[PDB]
Design a protein around this ligand. Sequence first.
Ligand SMILES: [Ca+2]
Ligand SMILES: [Ca+2]
Ligand SMILES: [Ca+2]
Ligand SMILES: [Ca+2]
Ligand SMILES: [Cl-]
Ligand SMILES: [Cl-]
Ligand SMILES: [Mg+2]
Ligand SMILES: [Mg+2]
Ligand code: NA
Ligand code: NA
Ligand code: NA
Ligand code: NA
Ligand code: NA
Ligand code: NA
Lengths: 233, 233, 6, 6
Amino acid sequence: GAMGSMERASLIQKAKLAEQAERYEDMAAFMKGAVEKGEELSCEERNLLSVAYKNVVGGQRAAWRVLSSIEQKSNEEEKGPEVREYREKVETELQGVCDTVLGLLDSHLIKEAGDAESRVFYLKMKGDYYRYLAEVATGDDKKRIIDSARSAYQEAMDISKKEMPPTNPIRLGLALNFSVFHYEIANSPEEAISLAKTTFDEAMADLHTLSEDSYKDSTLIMQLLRDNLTLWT
Amino acid sequence: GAMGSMERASLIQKAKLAEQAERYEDMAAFMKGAVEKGEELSCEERNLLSVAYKNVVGGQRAAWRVLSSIEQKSNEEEKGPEVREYREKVETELQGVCDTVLGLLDSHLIKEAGDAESRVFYLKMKGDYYRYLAEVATGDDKKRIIDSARSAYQEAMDISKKEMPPTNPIRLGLALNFSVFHYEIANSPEEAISLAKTTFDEAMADLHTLSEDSYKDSTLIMQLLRDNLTLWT
Amino acid sequence: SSNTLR
Amino acid sequence: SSNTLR
Ligand SMILES: [Ca+2]
Ligand SMILES: [Ca+2]
Ligand SMILES: [Ca+2]
Ligand SMILES: [Ca+2]
Ligand SMILES: [Cl-]
Ligand SMILES: [Cl-]
Ligand SMILES: [Mg+2]
Ligand SMILES: [Mg+2]
Ligand code: NA
Ligand code: NA
Ligand code: NA
Ligand code: NA
Ligand code: NA
Ligand code: NA
């Protein structure tokens, strides 16, 4: 790895600088290097890893959607293979980023994560990046990719419900994304709606236990659940 | 070049797709490939080349400014070499992009550009990318880099005043950027103000010759001259 | 477009 | 911050 010669602490420091400069590809490479040092990640370091790759894959997903739309229109004047070729190029890049993240989780973040907050975080991430693979998958391994996302989300859910209070932001963000998995990927809008509503209601009833700062963290994610329920119902 | 096997027309088509997907690094690579086919560029193709590299270097400049600010603050607790190292990394990348553009202009866009609209466009671009080099240059070749920008802008100005009407958008954009060169790079704010005011006034007096669409093109750039004069006076 | 964690 | 051609 090109980051093998840099100190772990220097990689984390530069990841934070890259975030300030909105250089997310750099940020991701720095955090990949930090992960490959082999030590577990702190809470803040996990969120640096997540922010970096979410922004990288977010740009790829947005570009893929633009190109896929153009391609679908083209298939309703013939302009040659270029639209498909370039959509395939972006798609392959996107799949490579997803494979990279999943590789870091499998070697060896998840197996060393024993605390609920780390294990749920990583399993949610595993579900997320299989979901992004599912967004562009067509047919053959599409079913297996979808089941891999489902399995990761489900293990994360089981742990979060046993070990975390209903207002825990990690638990809430997991439920949010799993509900979108149901709605957008698994063709299960009723499951999506039920999960979002139950998650929201159980969090509501637990808010009274929280400090002002924790209340703000939890209600921010609860608003995203409500925003989806407004779109879906 | 990695684009040597792709058709010129396919490169231009994919550059347009990349712009729609806001994939400007891809867009720049496609247009570099198109330039290296060796044929002159049409007006639309020149603007694809410009849009691509302006967005790429624009992101690098924004990141460099963020990091340079952090570095300058650090030099007013000691945190090691990381800020400088990462600023240097971004700076080197930026310089590489500028060198790439200048290389395309020198081999061989400028020497084959005979029409005023192409020659002024390319010479303005040469001034622009030497200016971006000057923004990060310190001392030794800083003076020579600044003079290279000045020389390119000046040749472009001489042609534009001989061959173009005062409302020509290329002429106006050249004057705008050369005035910013004077203000920001050459420590010549009075020259910057004089150029912007004379450019604006001579364009004003020529607007009556224009169609509605041309009037809109010219007044848009004239507003940028006025915005600068408002900042500067 | 559904909202996921940002 | 001065404006250049966008
Ligand atoms: Ca060490
Ligand atoms: Ca452990
Ligand atoms: Ca050909
Ligand atoms: Ca010629
Ligand atoms: Cl391609
Ligand atoms: Cl670095
Ligand atoms: Mg607990
Ligand atoms: Mg003329
Ligand atoms: Na090493
Ligand atoms: Na074609
Ligand atoms: Na594919
Ligand atoms: Na070739
Ligand atoms: Na340090
Ligand atoms: Na340097």
